[PDB]
RNA sequence: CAGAACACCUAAUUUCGAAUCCAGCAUGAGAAGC
């Protein structure tokens, strides 16, 4: 057998905001910032990659028109019989592609900055609301891999198509405000499952 | 720990100015009192009072008696004032009237299986602090614990589940099942016994659910053979062998048909069938 | 330390540094009338817990 | 004398002997035989005394048919039937509150906490299936514990 | 319409002005009797049972197997009990204890005090006592008297 | 026989780590607060199963190499008793020589387990359909285990180390596909005497 | 003859603890709600068989030293009646000096016994092929057992403590390979004149 | 009786936090001494 390594590299091109999900990390940062960035306990920034890739592939493949279910409606059960269900999982089989998180190569101090945002009154043209958030600066580099357990033929091109959708549309939050525009560099390799067996 | 009756003291298990060393015991004169020392305590059994007595050198516990001013004079002039005094050997109202005055000198009194509160509210009504509560007293073998109706609810529901899943509708009580000759029953149960779909546990469970009537056996064989809508998995043991996927299904169908056909055979006949396979029962 | 020894309460300095105080819980209700339901020796009782200094007691309606 | 205070429906037949699995309270009152309801009412009556001192109806066959249909579209899963057994067993006000909780359309999201139906149905009818599920599972609370268990162990055995 | 209780009315609690006891029931219909679980375990057992109603070479070999404990005093007593019962029970008995389980592989003989030698000695026990299953009962009695004193 | 292998395994956490709560009562106690509780002890420590992950790792890699290893992951599949993983982790006849403990954490929940929020983005309107809270283990959390092989041959070190490297690849437990469970291992191996404790 | 060694053993579980349910009716009553029930008393306390654990521990460690200790492990084996485990734990002609009590917990089932969900995962599909429920005793649960040794020698203490460190290393009960049953022992030893009841 | 380093104004707020599958198999029921 074989398994496919997809070493994925993200360079941030416009300030990246993904949100902190840990409750203890978030209600203890609320005295400082109203929008914390998702961080590790090693203080490196974490981005959820899988759902972005799977959302990308549902949107593009549904536009091309094949039988691909949606895993985005309210309690949407996967079918099991599609390319997205084979790659990323269903209620029967698991996902053949294990998509690791996007951890930054630098810690928070180099790449996270604490910015001030505002809501301007449209009539008086004055500052109406003010809130502080955290953003990942541009040029920060995030590394992931994607491992495909049972590799089929179309799978690299499919993942790279989703990685072109994420380059154009974005990853993370505040996506329509310009936050989260990224560039991907991908190095791929096919490896045998018996590699650690000396 | 003093147990009142006289005065018993459990450390050595003694029960009530030179020093006799048994638990350092030393008798001072009352004008007689005894001062006992142990690692957990410096107790003083005073006896009665008469005016200038001989108070010991720290009297951690002071077990005195009175039936009024002299009791309090003796409650003072004792270095390192006691932790808890004990008011014994008198009328209850006079003990309380003295005790109000030992509280006024800020010294605690007590007038004469482990039990655990598993409770949770409070009220400040009258002189004492409280919380009204209706509950249960369990008497476990080394504890006595207190619970409320939520715990009785949980064991009542456990008893209801354990007693509902214990008696079926028409078991051991008194048609349209398949039919097949005894020779094919021999060949099928031999074949399904070498490979492990019909195994000794399954033959034994068929034997109990056949002894509990035909309908209990029909129910058991159906719920063993019932393929799940979701997993697509039947409760048979998988056959040991190459069998790819469809003769798997035909083989489970063979087990279904053979057991269901064996159901209408006589009880002694299915016994002479099964003991060649499972010697026990 | 000398003045608080004069008030006749005890001092432990840190460089110069044994009663047990069990905050006891005790039951003041009848115990004899108990049954078994789920192999538990239980008894329904209704009353009043009274948290008195140095002693939590469980007292009946008679006490209240 | 002794008085049983229980309706003797749900009586099985063990061999030649009719039989009921049951839990209760011997009361030396008329030596009455009283159910758990008795205990809950008398517990709450003593709670109020202590502290003082200081549903629509549906037919049974329609309940089986509707719970059958809602089981096939997986609105009523066995997780729902198991938790409904827990909240009915705890009491009836708890089962009312649980069923109102799962049926409450949240005003901010518009979402019911049921499981969505399997298959193509119009959104009006999917909502009507939800309202049907509210009506049957609420109507189930009007029955005793015995028929509720006997109804829902055909769908979730272990419930 | 009558009701009769069959559970102890002695070890019962008192609470809230009612002498109450939580108890588990098995309401029977005939009068209407209320039984505990001991009666139900009884009836379950009794309905179950009701349904459950329906020559020098042998001396040398037995002298060998007495010392390595393959045949033993209990084995002599039960083999002689099968012989005293008859001949069919003897063949059934030695077939049952020689029966190597196809799942585990362990015979019901007592172990000797390789696997090829183990199989050869168990086969020696089979041919020894199966030869002894055909001789006269007096000879079986005098041979079995020498090794088991009681039988 | 006379010797026995002790493999002290120290695991550090890199990505968030989830392993679901298996005890019913502990889980239902936590489902009033969190929808995916971390598998936790009663001494407030994080418990991760470790034998089955090692067996699954060695099964997949030995099967890919070409060795005659049975698949015990299939539903009610009987281990034959002649594979390498049958000698290590166990068969039906004999138990495993390797007795793997759980990965007991070196800290205690309130320092390593955090309550997190995950969603389900509706793909066309980019809003949140479902929102669920799950507990996870922080990164840099230290877990300890010991693998005690009773009768060591020479391969039982390297096979365990290879399976550990596979657990660095796929993850130890829980949501391995979303990126959870990525861990690293350090190995301190020693061959102790069996008669060590006899004075 | 005039003295007995008393070994008050208090054992506290550092791991989940599974021993199997032994009684047929208790098992078959709890083979419905759970599939691997733990050993209970009828006073609802957890039983662990302790003598066989100590006897097995001593036999492996004493065969490791090369002492002429027998093995009552193989099928239908023989106590030789001459070893130190034969003197301690008994032979067929002589009883055991060390009478080893069952490991009686101080808590009941609702405090320490928890049901569970154990799984079997398919290696290729990464999905739960099998599910089964099994009771376990919690970590931090503590148990007591009194080992009483009549006719004591010098070395019964050392052998019993050595067996207890071996039980700590291996585990006690069942599922010992999965990490179950790893515990810690505390021992209070006391010499006793046998006539202290008079 | 311990920390201490050109200008303002702001730095809040609101939703969700659920839903589902599975909980099965299999082996062993004997010895021996007194
Ligand atoms: Zn799909
Ligand atoms: Zn194998
Ligand atoms: Zn020996």
PDB file of N, CA, C and O and ligand atoms in Angstrom, chain G residues 70 79-83 86, ligand 3:
ATOM      1  N   UNK G  70       7.907 -24.562  41.957  1.00  0.00           N
ATOM      2  CA  UNK G  70       7.095 -25.247  40.962  1.00  0.00           C
ATOM      3  C   UNK G  70       6.260 -24.227  40.187  1.00  0.00           C
ATOM      4  O   UNK G  70       6.476 -23.016  40.264  1.00  0.00           O
ATOM      5  N   UNK G  79       1.145 -28.903  42.795  1.00  0.00           N
ATOM      6  CA  UNK G  79       2.005 -28.309  43.824  1.00  0.00           C
ATOM      7  C   UNK G  79       2.945 -29.372  44.367  1.00  0.00           C
ATOM      8  O   UNK G  79       2.505 -30.414  44.857  1.00  0.00           O
ATOM      9  N   UNK G  80       4.246 -29.111  44.268  1.00  0.00           N
ATOM     10  CA  UNK G  80       5.224 -30.078  44.745  1.00  0.00           C
ATOM     11  C   UNK G  80       5.286 -30.151  46.265  1.00  0.00           C
ATOM     12  O   UNK G  80       5.765 -31.153  46.801  1.00  0.00           O
ATOM     13  N   UNK G  81       4.811 -29.129  46.971  1.00  0.00           N
ATOM     14  CA  UNK G  81       4.786 -29.177  48.422  1.00  0.00           C
ATOM     15  C   UNK G  81       6.128 -28.997  49.084  1.00  0.00           C
ATOM     16  O   UNK G  81       6.288 -29.339  50.260  1.00  0.00           O
ATOM     17  N   UNK G  82       7.110 -28.470  48.347  1.00  0.00           N
ATOM     18  CA  UNK G  82       8.476 -28.301  48.831  1.00  0.00           C
ATOM     19  C   UNK G  82       9.053 -26.913  48.588  1.00  0.00           C
ATOM     20  O   UNK G  82      10.113 -26.616  49.147  1.00  0.00           O
ATOM     21  N   UNK G  83       8.407 -26.052  47.802  1.00  0.00           N
ATOM     22  CA  UNK G  83       8.951 -24.744  47.460  1.00  0.00           C
ATOM     23  C   UNK G  83       8.578 -23.722  48.528  1.00  0.00           C
ATOM     24  O   UNK G  83       7.995 -24.054  49.562  1.00  0.00           O
ATOM     25  N   UNK G  86       4.924 -23.077  47.780  1.00  0.00           N
ATOM     26  CA  UNK G  86       4.186 -24.231  48.272  1.00  0.00           C
ATOM     27  C   UNK G  86       4.024 -24.177  49.782  1.00  0.00           C
ATOM     28  O   UNK G  86       3.008 -24.633  50.313  1.00  0.00           O
TER      29      UNK G  86
HETATM   30 ZN1  LIG I   3       5.981 -26.504  44.809  1.00  0.00          ZN
END
